[PDB]
Every structure is written in C-alpha cells, then in structure tokens.
Amino acid sequence: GNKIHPIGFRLGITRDWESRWYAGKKQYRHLLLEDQRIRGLLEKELYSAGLARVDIERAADNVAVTVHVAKPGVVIGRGGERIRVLREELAKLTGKNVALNVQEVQNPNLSAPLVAQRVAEQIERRFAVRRAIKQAVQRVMESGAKGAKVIVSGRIGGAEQARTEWAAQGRVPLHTLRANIDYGFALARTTYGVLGVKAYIFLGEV
Amino acid sequence: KIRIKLRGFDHKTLDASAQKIVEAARRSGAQVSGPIPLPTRVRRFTVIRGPFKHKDSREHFELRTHNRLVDIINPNRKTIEQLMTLDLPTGVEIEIKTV
Amino acid sequence: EQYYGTGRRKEAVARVFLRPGNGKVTVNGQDFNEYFQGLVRAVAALEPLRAVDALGHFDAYITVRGGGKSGQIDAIKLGIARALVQYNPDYRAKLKPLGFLTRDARVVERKKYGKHKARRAPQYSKR
Amino acid sequence: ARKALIEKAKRTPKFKVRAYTRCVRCGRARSVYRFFGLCRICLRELAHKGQLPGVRKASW
Amino acid sequence: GKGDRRTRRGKIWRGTYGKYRPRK
Amino acid sequence: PRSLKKGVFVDDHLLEKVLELNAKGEKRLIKTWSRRSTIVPEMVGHTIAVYNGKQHVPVYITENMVGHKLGEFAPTRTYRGHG
RNA sequence: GCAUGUGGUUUAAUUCGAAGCAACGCGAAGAACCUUACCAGGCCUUGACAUGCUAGGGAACCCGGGUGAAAGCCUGGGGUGCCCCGCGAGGGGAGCCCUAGCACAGGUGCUGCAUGGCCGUCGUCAGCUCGUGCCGUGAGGUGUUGGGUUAAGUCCCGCAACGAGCGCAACCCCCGCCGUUAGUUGCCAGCGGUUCGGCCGGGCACUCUAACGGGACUGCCCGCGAAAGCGGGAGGAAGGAGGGGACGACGUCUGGUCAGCAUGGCCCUUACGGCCUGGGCGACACACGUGCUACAAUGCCCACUACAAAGCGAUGCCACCCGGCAACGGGGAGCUAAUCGCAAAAAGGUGGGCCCAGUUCGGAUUGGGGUCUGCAACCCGACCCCAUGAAGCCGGAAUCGCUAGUAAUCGCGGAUCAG
Ligand SMILES: C[NH+](C)c1cc(NC(=O)CNC(C)(C)C)c(O)c2c1C[C@H]1C[C@H]3[C@H]([NH+](C)C)C(O)=C(C(N)=O)C(=O)[C@@]3(O)C(O)=C1C2=O
Ligand SMILES: [Mg+2]
Ligand SMILES: [Mg+2]
Ligand SMILES: [Mg+2]
Ligand SMILES: [Mg+2]
Ligand SMILES: [Mg+2]
Ligand SMILES: [Mg+2]
Ligand SMILES: [Mg+2]
Ligand SMILES: [Mg+2]
Ligand SMILES: [Mg+2]
Ligand SMILES: [Mg+2]
Ligand SMILES: [Mg+2]
Ligand SMILES: [Mg+2]
Ligand SMILES: [Mg+2]
Ligand SMILES: [Mg+2]
Ligand SMILES: [Mg+2]
Ligand SMILES: [Mg+2]
Ligand SMILES: [Mg+2]
Ligand SMILES: [Mg+2]
Ligand SMILES: [Mg+2]
Ligand SMILES: [Mg+2]
Ligand SMILES: [Mg+2]
Ligand SMILES: [Mg+2]
Ligand SMILES: [Mg+2]
Ligand SMILES: [Mg+2]
Ligand SMILES: [Mg+2]
Ligand SMILES: [Mg+2]
Ligand SMILES: [Zn+2]
Incomplete structure (x- = not known):
C-alpha cells in the first residue's frame, strides 16, 4: 500500500469537486451530512442505470442535483413516469428545493x-x-x-x-x-x- | 455607499463572480473603488494516512476561505436592479452592506 | 527632497528615507540607539553607507514591522543599500561585488510531520 | 459502530455531559472533527473523491 | 524555575496567571 | 475541592433513607450505590453499605469522618502483592 | 524526579491490538459516568435498528403517581386527527401503538495465514520491464552492458540493436526579486487641521493585502573536454535543480488491522446480542522504550523596556470596571471577525537584588486553605494562595539527531474537547 488516489490529487488542478457550494461552520457539518444521504439513496437505486458523477451545486437552500448516467431512460421510465417518483423522494429527505436533472454518459x-x-x-x-x-x-x-x-x-x-x-x-x-x-x-x-x-x-x- | 462581501471556495469563480458585478456598476451609473483582495483564512487538517498503527505518515488538507469586497460609490436606480439581474456564480455566497 | 529604498528580510519589512543633512537615524520615531540598545549587529546596519563615504552626508528616516531586530537590521541595512541607487545609479558598481544588494533568500524552513522540528528526528536505543 | 451505540449518542442523554459526537459515515467517535461530523479515515477517504467542497490537498 | 509554579516563567510555562503573574 | 459558593453535595435517594430513619429514631443498614456524596453530620452513627464493583462494604459512621466523601471508605480493587 | 506508552506481575475485571530497525507520547487529534468492547449487580426478549407477515386491541400522542442505585415494572388521566363509503349511529383503510407468534434484526464472537481497501517498509533507492529485430536446441541473452557524466536508466560516445510503458525529471503549492488589475476593516512619504492617538480632512505613494503573469537557459566570458559535463567569474534578488512541500516504479516481508467501514467462512441469537447505576483500563516487589524540568553564574530572581509570524472566536473571543493577595466571580462595551478579542510574544534591552550555597540552584512529595468545569472530582481532574523544599553539583558499559537559517535555544498557535 504505497501510492495515491489520482482524483484526490488534482483537486482543482485538472479535475473538480462534485459537491460545489459554499458553507459556514454551522452549515457545512449538516449541509454535507445531507449530500451523503442524497448520494446514498440516489446510488442504491440508480445502479442498473449506470450512474457516474453526481454534482450537488448549492445556493440559498436550493439544492442542484445533476446526474451523469449511462442509461438516462432507466432514470426516466416511460414518458417522465419514474423520475418524478424520486425528484420528491429527495425533497422528502432534504425538506427543500431538489432540482434533480439528467445527463447521459455519452x-x-x-x-x-x-x-x-x-x-x-x-x-x-x-x-x-x-x-x-x-x-x-x-x-x-x-x-x-x-x-x-x-x-x-x-x-x-x-x-x-x-x-x-x-x-x-x-x-x-x-x-x-x-x-x-x-x-x-x-x-x-x-x-x-x-x-x-x-x-x-x-x-x-x- | 453599497458594499458587497463575497465569501467562497475557488479563487476562480470568486474572481469571476466579482468581475461581472464590477462591470454593471460602471455602465449602470456608478464610479467604483475596484475589486478588493482580502485577508484569506486557512483551516487545515492534518491526518493519519493509516487505518491503524502507522502514525508518523500523515496527509495534508487546506480549506481556503476567500474574501472579496467591492464598494459602489453613487448607486443609481439605473444600477441596483442591474446587479440583481447579473447574479449567476454557483459556489459563491454574496452579501450586501450599506453605511 | 527624499530618496527611498525597499528593505525586506525573513518575515520582517523595513522602510528607508535618505535626506541630505546629518547622520541622525529615526527608526519608528526613536533614535538609532534608543531602539537598538545593548545590541551589536545594531551599528552594522549602516555598513552599506560607509563603503562610499557618506555617514554624515544623509539623514535617516526609518520604519519597520515584523521579525526581530536582527532580521529588521538586515532589512534596514538592505534598505540603505537599495536607497543609494535611487540617488546614484552609479553607486551600483561599488555595492554589488561588495554584496550589499541582495535579499538574504534564507528563511525559516517548515516544520515537518514526524520530525520534532523539521530536520531533528526522534532518538531511539534498542535500534 | 455497534449499531445501537451510534444510537446511544444520537438521542439526547440523561445529563448534558454525556454529549460525545460520532461519525455519520461509519460510527467511530475516536478521532472526530466537529466540523465534518466525520473522522480522519473518512475525511480523507471522501476528500480523496472531492466530495467535500473546497477541501484541497495541502502543501507549503 | 520552569517546572516551578510560584514564579515568573513557571507560570507562563503552565500558561496560567496568579499572584506571581499579573494581568497588568 | 467542591465549590463553597455552591455548598456541599449528596444524592437525594440516599439522603431520603437517612432523614426518615433519623425522624423515627431507628438505625438500619442502608444499601445504596452512590459514593459520589459527602457524608454530613446528620448521618453520624448510621450503618451504611457502600459499593465497590461487586461488594457492599461495612462502614459504620463515626464523628470526625465528617466532610470526606463516601468512596474513601470502600476500596475499589484488591492489592496484597506480587508473590 | 515527574509525564506518557510498554514488558512483566496483580486483579471480580485491570477490555483489545501493536512486536528487531519498519511495536513502545503508536490505534487514543482528549477514558471521572459517557466514551467502553471489560467486570459485579438490577434487568429487556421482534429486542437501542431495518423492510415486513398473521391473530386480536389500540389514533399518534402527552401529563402524574408508586417502588427504585438507576434502568425496569405495576399504574392514574388528558387525547381520539387522516383516507374511502354513508342521512346516520358507525364499519372498511393508511399510518403508527400494544400484546402473542413468526420472518429476522444485532455481535468491537474468530481467522489479517481465506479477502477488499488503506497504511508501513527496503526507498525518492535508481532502479522494473515490453515490442519488433538480433543471438543460443533451449531456459535465456541482447536492449539496460563498457568509457565519460549525473542527486538519477541524467545525459554525451560507443556498440545488434531501435523505441516505448511504469519510475527520475518537469506541469501544482510555499518561500526569494519584480511588473499588471486593487485601495477596505490595512497603509502614512508630501500638504491641511489636530483632544497628540493615522485621531480627522485628503491620499494610496510604500508596507501589507490575494489573483494573475515576468524571470535562469550552462545564456556570457577564460580554462578543461570528441561530447555530455566540469571549475573559476561578469551581470542578477536568485546560478547551475535557489531553499522547502505534495509526489513512492514492477515487487517483498503470507509485515499491519476483521477494533473505522466493507466481506467468505466457523460461531451466539430469553444471549457474547440490549438497557442500566457502580467498579475498571490509572492497579505496582520491577524493567525497558519516549519526553519534561533540573542539577544553575553565559545564571536565578523583581521591576521598567522593546521586535514576531501564523491560526481560532457571535451556542464563542471576552477589551475595561469593581471585589479578592489570586484562581476567578459580578457588571458590561466591541466582533458574521485586516475592523473587536485571545495577546503577555519569550529569550534580547535598561536598572537593581543574589555571590558557590543542596543554595533566592532545583521544584518533587506532602499538610491546610480556596476558585472553576460539571447531574457528579473518593477512586480519578485542572488551576489559586499559604506552609513542606525530595533526588539530582552535568551522569557506567552502550547509544541518538542534525550538513545552514539546519543544529541547538525561546515564545505563540491550532486541531481534539464542558473540563
Ligand atoms: C506461528 N506461525 C505458525 C504462524 C501461523 C499463522 N497462521 C495460522 O496458523 C493460521 N492457519 C489456519 C488457516 C487458521 C489453519 C500465521 O498467520 C503467522 C505465523 C508466523 C507469524 C510470525 C510473525 C513474527 N512476529 C511479529 C511475531 C514476524 O517476526 C514476522 C516477520 N516476518 O517480521 C511475521 O510475519 C509475523 O508477524 C506473522 O505474520 C506471522 C503469521 O502471520
Ligand atoms: Mg524555529
Ligand atoms: Mg514517535
Ligand atoms: Mg460491524
Ligand atoms: Mg464528551
Ligand atoms: Mg525558584
Ligand atoms: Mg482481535
Ligand atoms: Mg467506565
Ligand atoms: Mg498481511
Ligand atoms: Mg496478529
Ligand atoms: Mg501475519
Ligand atoms: Mg533521487
Ligand atoms: Mg534463435
Ligand atoms: Mg542506446
Ligand atoms: Mg535491469
Ligand atoms: Mg552486456
Ligand atoms: Mg529515461
Ligand atoms: Mg479611508
Ligand atoms: Mg503632518
Ligand atoms: Mg516528481
Ligand atoms: Mg516483523
Ligand atoms: Mg492507555
Ligand atoms: Mg482588584
Ligand atoms: Mg471573569
Ligand atoms: Mg553550583
Ligand atoms: Mg543532508
Ligand atoms: Mg504550545
Ligand atoms: Zn469516521
């Protein structure tokens, strides 16, 4: 066990953070705790869709959950049917403004x-x-x-x-x-x- | 007159964010004392690379609070709305003073 | 009339002002001795002045912040140093191969992890 | 992390002295930063994925 | 002393204040 | 030791068994698990069992064993030697 | 001598693991209960936790008593929302609640020698290899070797080799010089006023303040040399990589941990699982490993006197004011923090006291008195004041660190955390 993680090296050198906010000492502790629920549920389910990189940009109590994923219509369902089931199941966990998008892994x-x-x-x-x-x-x-x-x-x-x-x-x-x-x-x-x-x-x- | 305080994480957006703001307070009717670099603050975290016993091998992280501050002298009613129709940076937190 | 130099050394910064007149030195208001008392490197700060013949030719207005009085005195000295090329861009000949125009690039190295004080490590019998 | 022992620290206690933190992500309260609600193992592990904003890798 | 408590530097060392280290 | 600006300290459930058997001019052996408490002059002459880990220990309370806490008269471990 | 780990003993338990360098102030960047896996007692059984199934009652829920070391248990009362059907009493339903049963939960039970991952290490050492070809019947060699050079497999020349992949190196950060954008809460060289305090007008010069760029290349010269390189110098803030950081190659030690988490497997599941109060990891005929302060005159001490960088703080930092010899308590102004505060920097400086003393050295261990945090300082805390003033006059054999702003010496800070 000798070497280092590649991503965690280029932290703002030739990469970028997934969760890209600001936060105070009061907020960062709780605020982040949230993302690791957002990214625990989101993952656990979306698996057989092939989920990749999970952005969570943030403004004044507006969460901005983007999602890169292999197969955008196993996030979707038929029409727009199953994406809605989740888009609130997150505002069910946050208690706020979940803007859960989709972006195909080209x-x-x-x-x-x-x-x-x-x-x-x-x-x-x-x-x-x-x-x-x-x-x-x-x-x-x-x-x-x-x-x-x-x-x-x-x-x-x-x-x-x-x-x-x-x-x-x-x-x-x-x-x-x-x-x-x-x-x-x-x-x-x-x-x-x-x-x-x-x-x-x-x-x-x- | 009206003073702004930008507190973010990058040095990139935090410079970008404050230079969009610095254009629509010149065109819109205001002289301005420029973009101000401030006393940044560092919170560092020194940690044992290892799960277990191997203490004296350690990793280093620094969370860099970046402070910016721009002053608007002569704030018009041609102005104030031009800067609530400029708002667009993502990791930044803005605040608005006035004495 | 005033000639000024930029003097800096090891987390300490010093500002120099060279007027024509005496040889009195005010460093943060105080005389050269009422600020550099029983300290010997003190009178050494003036060295870059006396290798061109001018202690008594100019006055000295001074300001310093940071470091300790040695690290200030090195900077003070490096200030009277730079200050003389703004008066005589010909004095440059005399005080470089005499060495008085250089930032002592030397610096208190970082404390390292695992090492009591950067370089020093921990003693161990039963090796 | 004995499961029930995340819970003896979740709920509020008999008296306020017993208020010891723990990790949200694994339940080791042995070395925890009340700024991440996280420990040292975690904080890296995660920081190594850039999942904590502004958490850079340090050097001077 | 320095491990000595009732003194100048010996307070300072501990970090403390007492009759032997004032608050000015 | 214990702040004087905040007076002495004793646990309620323990003081309860004392000034009820004081108020009835009787004496019995008490069984409590506090050690954290300061014996007071209105317990003198009581038979009190204090606990160390596994055992309630015989501590009849005399005079000048006054302000000392309970746990000073109930050794916690066992040490006689090494061999 | 004390502080901290550790070996051995002891223990109702003193929970665990670490094992030559590369275990030993290491997991602990905070064990009074908590943490807590340990031991002694009082207990809980779909369980502190998950998604449920079936039978029967229950809205959820909220208040009180009794017994008690607390848990736990027996028990009084307040309450009766939501969905569908209906005129209606009221039945059906979702949630959650209880009782009984079942799925099962949960385990810091084991094995790091069944694993993941991450860490240590030989080692920031210059090494480890492949392709095509060449050479041996082959394993294999050649390349990578020899000579020169390099912190280097760095590079120059030679060679049956030619190149590439992972390393070296550069691109990232810090410090050193300087230029562009910038003038607040920082800054004060000139001018105006000044309660003499950058205090105010005014200015942003310089210091600083962060963002981006510039600059160093063996470029110049004499010499040495096929070359790469090397030695001395000129200019330059920096010179041959300028100093420092992150950065650890194919592999080894079946090295490390099932005690962060993850998981094959063996193992308990009215008990190792769960809750609780108390006791314990701190015990002490010893031994090592790490460090603190000493044994003092280049010093100890009491005054007056200067010069720091970094970080933290609105559930906190606490300027001053008063009380107290003091810890601190009371009152209370400022501060989302370049604006206010921790803040006293300390060795240095001025002036004076000590005069070789177990000492005004030294600051143990004790007797008593108080302050604070905290439900709670007996185990088992820190701090204040008084009195006690121990060992030790620089340390056996052995042995450790450091090549320059380093070693030594002196102070400040942060994390953890009520303390
Ligand atoms: C004692 N031997 C037979 C042994 C046995 C096992 N494992 C088993 O027997 C388990 N076998 C099963 C599968 C259960 C049937 C073992 O697993 C081991 C060892 C050897 C040890 C040696 C260790 C040693 N020190 C630290 C005690 C040591 O010096 C080294 C070293 N090379 O430096 C070790 O490797 C050592 O730590 C070690 O790893 C051992 C074993 O692992
Ligand atoms: Mg130093
Ligand atoms: Mg060590
Ligand atoms: Mg587990
Ligand atoms: Mg606690
Ligand atoms: Mg003394
Ligand atoms: Mg084990
Ligand atoms: Mg305990
Ligand atoms: Mg192993
Ligand atoms: Mg083992
Ligand atoms: Mg092994
Ligand atoms: Mg090397
Ligand atoms: Mg052949
Ligand atoms: Mg070749
Ligand atoms: Mg080879
Ligand atoms: Mg060869
Ligand atoms: Mg190469
Ligand atoms: Mg101003
Ligand atoms: Mg003036
Ligand atoms: Mg490199
Ligand atoms: Mg070994
Ligand atoms: Mg221990
Ligand atoms: Mg007073
Ligand atoms: Mg106070
Ligand atoms: Mg002597
Ligand atoms: Mg060296
Ligand atoms: Mg300190
Ligand atoms: Zn953790």
Missing part, C-alpha cells in the same frame, strides 16, 4: 467508474477473470482514450490463495499532474467474498 468506456463497474459486475458474473480485464482495457483504446489500465484484486476465480492481476496500455502517467486521469473504484461480491477493482484512464495533457 461515451461509456471513456468514463472510469462505469468501466470499473461492468468489470466488477463481470466478476460477480462468474466470467473469465483475465479476459474480463483485457477486453476491459481493450475497449478503452478502442473508444479512443490516451491510456488504459484495470486492476482486478481479490481471491480471484474462486481461489483460496488471494492474489491480484491486471494489464494496461498507452500513457498511464500519474506523476504528471497535467495529465487528466479518472479513477474507478468498483467492488464485486462473490460467494467467496469481496473483490475491489480499479480502472484508470488517461484522456489528455492540457
């Missing part, structure tokens, strides 16, 4: 946490450990990314001896700040236990 391979998920799924899915990770990466320099890398990391394939694996390609340079890379932590669950997964993608130097 290219899905070119956004890490998704990439992480489908793999962690594929491991839950009892697939070919290696090939999962190979094709994982495969598609990433197939959609057109600068760099790719996936790190399967459990008791792998059902083995009693805990190991780890991976592969990659292209530029992976996390010591260049000015290189934008997205981290994806997933976390499969299989009969033998729990097998966290990682995925890093380079898009470009700026």
Whole structure:
C-alpha cells in the first residue's frame, strides 16, 4: 500500500469537486451530512442505470442535483413516469428545493467508474477473470482514450490463495499532474467474498 | 455607499463572480473603488494516512476561505436592479452592506 | 527632497528615507540607539553607507514591522543599500561585488510531520 | 459502530455531559472533527473523491 | 524555575496567571 | 475541592433513607450505590453499605469522618502483592 | 524526579491490538459516568435498528403517581386527527401503538495465514520491464552492458540493436526579486487641521493585502573536454535543480488491522446480542522504550523596556470596571471577525537584588486553605494562595539527531474537547 488516489490529487488542478457550494461552520457539518444521504439513496437505486458523477451545486437552500448516467431512460421510465417518483423522494429527505436533472454518459468506456463497474459486475458474473480485464482495457483504446489500465484484486476465480492481476496500455502517467486521469473504484461480491477493482484512464495533457 | 462581501471556495469563480458585478456598476451609473483582495483564512487538517498503527505518515488538507469586497460609490436606480439581474456564480455566497 | 529604498528580510519589512543633512537615524520615531540598545549587529546596519563615504552626508528616516531586530537590521541595512541607487545609479558598481544588494533568500524552513522540528528526528536505543 | 451505540449518542442523554459526537459515515467517535461530523479515515477517504467542497490537498 | 509554579516563567510555562503573574 | 459558593453535595435517594430513619429514631443498614456524596453530620452513627464493583462494604459512621466523601471508605480493587 | 506508552506481575475485571530497525507520547487529534468492547449487580426478549407477515386491541400522542442505585415494572388521566363509503349511529383503510407468534434484526464472537481497501517498509533507492529485430536446441541473452557524466536508466560516445510503458525529471503549492488589475476593516512619504492617538480632512505613494503573469537557459566570458559535463567569474534578488512541500516504479516481508467501514467462512441469537447505576483500563516487589524540568553564574530572581509570524472566536473571543493577595466571580462595551478579542510574544534591552550555597540552584512529595468545569472530582481532574523544599553539583558499559537559517535555544498557535 504505497501510492495515491489520482482524483484526490488534482483537486482543482485538472479535475473538480462534485459537491460545489459554499458553507459556514454551522452549515457545512449538516449541509454535507445531507449530500451523503442524497448520494446514498440516489446510488442504491440508480445502479442498473449506470450512474457516474453526481454534482450537488448549492445556493440559498436550493439544492442542484445533476446526474451523469449511462442509461438516462432507466432514470426516466416511460414518458417522465419514474423520475418524478424520486425528484420528491429527495425533497422528502432534504425538506427543500431538489432540482434533480439528467445527463447521459455519452461515451461509456471513456468514463472510469462505469468501466470499473461492468468489470466488477463481470466478476460477480462468474466470467473469465483475465479476459474480463483485457477486453476491459481493450475497449478503452478502442473508444479512443490516451491510456488504459484495470486492476482486478481479490481471491480471484474462486481461489483460496488471494492474489491480484491486471494489464494496461498507452500513457498511464500519474506523476504528471497535467495529465487528466479518472479513477474507478468498483467492488464485486462473490460467494467467496469481496473483490475491489480499479480502472484508470488517461484522456489528455492540457 | 453599497458594499458587497463575497465569501467562497475557488479563487476562480470568486474572481469571476466579482468581475461581472464590477462591470454593471460602471455602465449602470456608478464610479467604483475596484475589486478588493482580502485577508484569506486557512483551516487545515492534518491526518493519519493509516487505518491503524502507522502514525508518523500523515496527509495534508487546506480549506481556503476567500474574501472579496467591492464598494459602489453613487448607486443609481439605473444600477441596483442591474446587479440583481447579473447574479449567476454557483459556489459563491454574496452579501450586501450599506453605511 | 527624499530618496527611498525597499528593505525586506525573513518575515520582517523595513522602510528607508535618505535626506541630505546629518547622520541622525529615526527608526519608528526613536533614535538609532534608543531602539537598538545593548545590541551589536545594531551599528552594522549602516555598513552599506560607509563603503562610499557618506555617514554624515544623509539623514535617516526609518520604519519597520515584523521579525526581530536582527532580521529588521538586515532589512534596514538592505534598505540603505537599495536607497543609494535611487540617488546614484552609479553607486551600483561599488555595492554589488561588495554584496550589499541582495535579499538574504534564507528563511525559516517548515516544520515537518514526524520530525520534532523539521530536520531533528526522534532518538531511539534498542535500534 | 455497534449499531445501537451510534444510537446511544444520537438521542439526547440523561445529563448534558454525556454529549460525545460520532461519525455519520461509519460510527467511530475516536478521532472526530466537529466540523465534518466525520473522522480522519473518512475525511480523507471522501476528500480523496472531492466530495467535500473546497477541501484541497495541502502543501507549503 | 520552569517546572516551578510560584514564579515568573513557571507560570507562563503552565500558561496560567496568579499572584506571581499579573494581568497588568 | 467542591465549590463553597455552591455548598456541599449528596444524592437525594440516599439522603431520603437517612432523614426518615433519623425522624423515627431507628438505625438500619442502608444499601445504596452512590459514593459520589459527602457524608454530613446528620448521618453520624448510621450503618451504611457502600459499593465497590461487586461488594457492599461495612462502614459504620463515626464523628470526625465528617466532610470526606463516601468512596474513601470502600476500596475499589484488591492489592496484597506480587508473590 | 515527574509525564506518557510498554514488558512483566496483580486483579471480580485491570477490555483489545501493536512486536528487531519498519511495536513502545503508536490505534487514543482528549477514558471521572459517557466514551467502553471489560467486570459485579438490577434487568429487556421482534429486542437501542431495518423492510415486513398473521391473530386480536389500540389514533399518534402527552401529563402524574408508586417502588427504585438507576434502568425496569405495576399504574392514574388528558387525547381520539387522516383516507374511502354513508342521512346516520358507525364499519372498511393508511399510518403508527400494544400484546402473542413468526420472518429476522444485532455481535468491537474468530481467522489479517481465506479477502477488499488503506497504511508501513527496503526507498525518492535508481532502479522494473515490453515490442519488433538480433543471438543460443533451449531456459535465456541482447536492449539496460563498457568509457565519460549525473542527486538519477541524467545525459554525451560507443556498440545488434531501435523505441516505448511504469519510475527520475518537469506541469501544482510555499518561500526569494519584480511588473499588471486593487485601495477596505490595512497603509502614512508630501500638504491641511489636530483632544497628540493615522485621531480627522485628503491620499494610496510604500508596507501589507490575494489573483494573475515576468524571470535562469550552462545564456556570457577564460580554462578543461570528441561530447555530455566540469571549475573559476561578469551581470542578477536568485546560478547551475535557489531553499522547502505534495509526489513512492514492477515487487517483498503470507509485515499491519476483521477494533473505522466493507466481506467468505466457523460461531451466539430469553444471549457474547440490549438497557442500566457502580467498579475498571490509572492497579505496582520491577524493567525497558519516549519526553519534561533540573542539577544553575553565559545564571536565578523583581521591576521598567522593546521586535514576531501564523491560526481560532457571535451556542464563542471576552477589551475595561469593581471585589479578592489570586484562581476567578459580578457588571458590561466591541466582533458574521485586516475592523473587536485571545495577546503577555519569550529569550534580547535598561536598572537593581543574589555571590558557590543542596543554595533566592532545583521544584518533587506532602499538610491546610480556596476558585472553576460539571447531574457528579473518593477512586480519578485542572488551576489559586499559604506552609513542606525530595533526588539530582552535568551522569557506567552502550547509544541518538542534525550538513545552514539546519543544529541547538525561546515564545505563540491550532486541531481534539464542558473540563
Ligand atoms: C506461528 N506461525 C505458525 C504462524 C501461523 C499463522 N497462521 C495460522 O496458523 C493460521 N492457519 C489456519 C488457516 C487458521 C489453519 C500465521 O498467520 C503467522 C505465523 C508466523 C507469524 C510470525 C510473525 C513474527 N512476529 C511479529 C511475531 C514476524 O517476526 C514476522 C516477520 N516476518 O517480521 C511475521 O510475519 C509475523 O508477524 C506473522 O505474520 C506471522 C503469521 O502471520
Ligand atoms: Mg524555529
Ligand atoms: Mg514517535
Ligand atoms: Mg460491524
Ligand atoms: Mg464528551
Ligand atoms: Mg525558584
Ligand atoms: Mg482481535
Ligand atoms: Mg467506565
Ligand atoms: Mg498481511
Ligand atoms: Mg496478529
Ligand atoms: Mg501475519
Ligand atoms: Mg533521487
Ligand atoms: Mg534463435
Ligand atoms: Mg542506446
Ligand atoms: Mg535491469
Ligand atoms: Mg552486456
Ligand atoms: Mg529515461
Ligand atoms: Mg479611508
Ligand atoms: Mg503632518
Ligand atoms: Mg516528481
Ligand atoms: Mg516483523
Ligand atoms: Mg492507555
Ligand atoms: Mg482588584
Ligand atoms: Mg471573569
Ligand atoms: Mg553550583
Ligand atoms: Mg543532508
Ligand atoms: Mg504550545
Ligand atoms: Zn469516521
């Protein structure tokens, strides 16, 4: 356990915070506590929609929950039917002005946490450990990314001896700040236990 | 006359936010003493990188309160509404003084 | 008439004013000694003046804030230093290879985590 | 976090002295910042996702 | 002293005030 | 020690068993779990059982054991030696 | 000597884990109950918690007594909203409430040697590798090696190699110089007034104040050298990366923790689960590991006297005023904080007292007196004043840190938190 999280490095250097407000000492404590309910319910449900990055910008007791997600019509339903069910179930938890939008994950391979998920799924899915990770990466320099890398990391394939694996390609340079890379932590669950997964993608130097 | 106090988190929006404001208090009928950089305040958090025993390895976070302050001399009724039709920055908190 | 210099050194800042006349020094109102008493680096601040022949040629109006009187005295000195190129942009020849035009870029390094005081670490027998 | 022991600190107590905080996110009250209602493990863990606004990574 | 309480610096060290460290 | 600007201290349930058996000129062994309280001169000559962890301990109350708290007469642990 | 961890003992329990450097002021950036997993007692059983199912009663809910160490239990009363049907009494329904039963909850029970993640470490060491080709029947080699150079696999030259990927390095921050936008709550060089206080008019010069840019490249010169580089200098605030930070490569120690959380599995589920008051992690024939103050004359002490940066504070910071030898109490002005406050910076300076003393050194451990926080200071607190004035006259073998604003020495601050 030697290295550092890539996102938490470029905190306003080549990335950005999800929750982007202000707050006082009185408010920040409670105000944030809220976001971690907003992002606990929102997640727990939206899973099989492929949810990515969850913005929560804030004005005077106006919450502004944007949502990037693989599949905008499993957030929606038919017509506008199921998005409403939630848009209030949040104002049910806040007690205020939930503006819960939707924004499609255009290219899905070119956004890490998704990439992480489908793999962690594929491991839950009892697939070919290696090939999962190979094709994982495969598609990433197939959609057109600068760099790719996936790190399967459990008791792998059902083995009693805990190991780890991976592969990659292209530029992976996390010591260049000015290189934008997205981290994806997933976390499969299989009969033998729990097998966290990682995925890093380079898009470009700026 | 009317004084504003911007307290936010970026150095970006907080400069942006206050320079949109600084244009529609010139066109709209007001001389103005410019955008004012103030005594920023730092709240830092030093923490044990490790779950358990490995104490003397530590991480460093700084939350930077950024204070801006612009003065409007000669505030018109051609003005005051031009700045409630300018409001648009997101992580900022604005406040409005007057003596 | 007044010639001024910008004097700065190690969290302390000093302001210098060079009028033609005596050799009295007011540093925050007080005389050069009623502010730099039994302290020896004191009279050293004037050095950048006496390598061109002019202690008694000019007066000294002074102001300082921050640091300790040494770190001020270094800045005071670095103030009379700069102050003389605004009078004679030819005095520059004399007081650079004599070294009096430089910010002592030296600075109280940061205290580090794990280390009692930055560099110093913790003692340990039974190694 | 013994579940019921988040709750012995949630509800208000017999006397006001017993008012010890805890983590909203995990229920370790051992090292908690009454400014995040969070501990040190959490605060990083999260800050490392940029999920706490203005929380930068420090250096000087 | 410094671990000494009834004195100049020994108060200052503890942080305290007493008959031996005034409030001016 | 205890502020004088705020007088002495005793628990109610405990003082209740004292000035009712005082007001009936009788004496019985009391069983209470407070130690946190200051014995007062209107308990002198009472048989009082105080608790340490597991045991109620025999503490008949005489004179000049006045302002001392209860817990001074009820050792909490056991130490005789190491071998 | 005291403070803090730790080994060993002791204990009703002194809850746990850490284990050569890389466990030992480390998990604890705050154990009086709380925290609290521990022990002794009084107890709770769909349970402090979730989404429910079935039978029967109940709106939710709110007030009081009794017994009690508290919990807990027995019990008095106030209350009877919402949805649908209806003229109506009133039945049906959702919620929630109780009693009985069942799903199940919950466990800081185990195994870090079944895992996740995150951390430590060899190590900021210059290393670790792949492609195509070349070479061996092959594992494999070559490349990456040799010579020169570099903080470096940094680079120059050579070579059957040519390049790339993860490292080095740069892009990010801090400090050093300076320019652009800026003049409040900061600033005062000139002029006006001045209750002599930047106090007011006026100004934003400079100091500061944060945002963006500029600048350093072996560029210049003599020398050394195939080159990369190197040595001395000129200019420059900075010179060969200027100082400092974040930044930890493929892998190892089956290193670390099921005690933040996450989870395979073994394990209890009227009991390890739950609530409670009290007791305990602080015990003490010892031993180590870390630090504080000392043993003093380059000093101790009492006055007067200067010069800081950083951070916190409207459930708080508390200028002054009075009382008290004092802690502090009472009264009370300002402050969403460059405007008010913690705030006394301390070593330094001026002046004087001590004159080699177990001492005006030293400040333990005790006797008594008080203040404060707090339901509550006996275990087991901090602070005030008085009296007590211990060991120790610089430390065995062994052993630790630091290469410059560093080492030493002196003060301020923040987090945690009523204290
Ligand atoms: C005693 N041996 C047989 C042992 C056993 C186990 N695990 C089991 O037996 C469990 N096996 C099951 C699956 C339950 C059947 C073990 O799990 C271990 C060990 C060895 C220890 C050694 C440890 C040691 N120090 C700290 C006590 C040490 O010096 C090191 C080291 N290399 O520095 C260790 O690795 C050590 O800490 C360690 O990890 C051990 C074990 O893990
Ligand atoms: Mg220092
Ligand atoms: Mg240490
Ligand atoms: Mg748990
Ligand atoms: Mg508490
Ligand atoms: Mg003394
Ligand atoms: Mg254990
Ligand atoms: Mg306890
Ligand atoms: Mg391990
Ligand atoms: Mg172990
Ligand atoms: Mg092990
Ligand atoms: Mg290096
Ligand atoms: Mg061949
Ligand atoms: Mg080559
Ligand atoms: Mg090699
Ligand atoms: Mg070779
Ligand atoms: Mg290279
Ligand atoms: Mg003004
Ligand atoms: Mg004047
Ligand atoms: Mg680097
Ligand atoms: Mg070991
Ligand atoms: Mg302990
Ligand atoms: Mg008085
Ligand atoms: Mg007071
Ligand atoms: Mg002597
Ligand atoms: Mg060195
Ligand atoms: Mg301190
Ligand atoms: Zn926590």
